[PDB]
Amino acid sequence: GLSDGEWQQVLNVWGKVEADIAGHGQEVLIRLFTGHPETLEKFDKFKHLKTEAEMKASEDLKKHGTVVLTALGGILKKKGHHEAELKPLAQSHATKHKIPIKYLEFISDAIIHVLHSKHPGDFGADAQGAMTKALELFRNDIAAKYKELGFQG
Numbered sequence: 001g002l003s004d005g006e007w008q009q010v011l012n013v014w015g016k017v018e019a020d021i022a023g024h025g026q027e028v029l030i031r032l033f034t035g036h037p038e039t040l041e042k043f044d045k046f047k048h049l050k051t052e053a054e055m056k057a058s059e060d061l062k063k064h065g066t067v068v069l070t071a072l073g074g075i076l077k078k079k080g081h082h083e084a085e086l087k088p089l090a091q092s093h094a095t096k097h098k099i100p101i102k103y104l105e106f107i108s109d110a111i112i113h114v115l116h117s118k119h120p121g122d123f124g125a126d127a128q129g130a131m132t133k134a135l136e137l138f139r140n141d142i143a144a145k146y147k148e149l150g151f152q153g
């Protein structure tokens with residue numbers, strides 16, 4: 001798991017996200033969709049977004065970014081004790097949304113990118129290490145639930 005110090009770094013970084021959750025969420029999703037267009041196809045309600053300008057102008061995309069990062073933030077604040085919060089998300093993403101674990105890797109990478117992009121010089125090496133560990137733990141616990149379900153994608 002993560003040490004006390006590492007969790008503290010994670011939650012300090014998260015304070016930066018919370019100052020503009022919609023903006024961070026929007027940029028995370030745009031990074032995901034532009035870097036990996038196959039991910040956009042999982043969202044019937046975002047398929048019409050043909051260009052990045054359209055993505056940037058989508059108020060619904062910002063709304064969804066808020067929903068995603070709010071869920072993630074609640075999970076991070078549990079500092080690993082997140083079974084009850086994580087289980088339903090793992091199950092909805094496997095059974096309903098059909099999201100391969102690879103796409104969770106993609107979005108994890110997008111979060112790290114957006115943190116540097118929005119806070120250049122203010123996302124230190126220790127903070128990146130801690131946030132990476134937290135996102136890996138999240139992904140790994142989802143992966144365990146995916147294996148239970150026999151879900152691949």
Ligand code: HEM
Pocket residue numbers: 039040042043044045067068069071072088089092093097099103104107
């Ligand atoms: C940080 C990781 C993620 C978190 C915390 C997250 C969270 C959520 C939440 C809270 C919802 C609404 C409730 C639900 O359906 O369970 C949702 C819906 C959804 N998620 Fe995710 N999600 C994540 C990653 C992804 C990724 C990587 C994809 C696809 C590439 C994805 C695809 C979807 C889709 C298609 C919906 C339904 C959207 C709609 O039509 O309203 N999710 N997600």
Ligand SMILES: [O-][O-]
Pocket residue numbers: 068
């Ligand atoms: O996308 O959640």
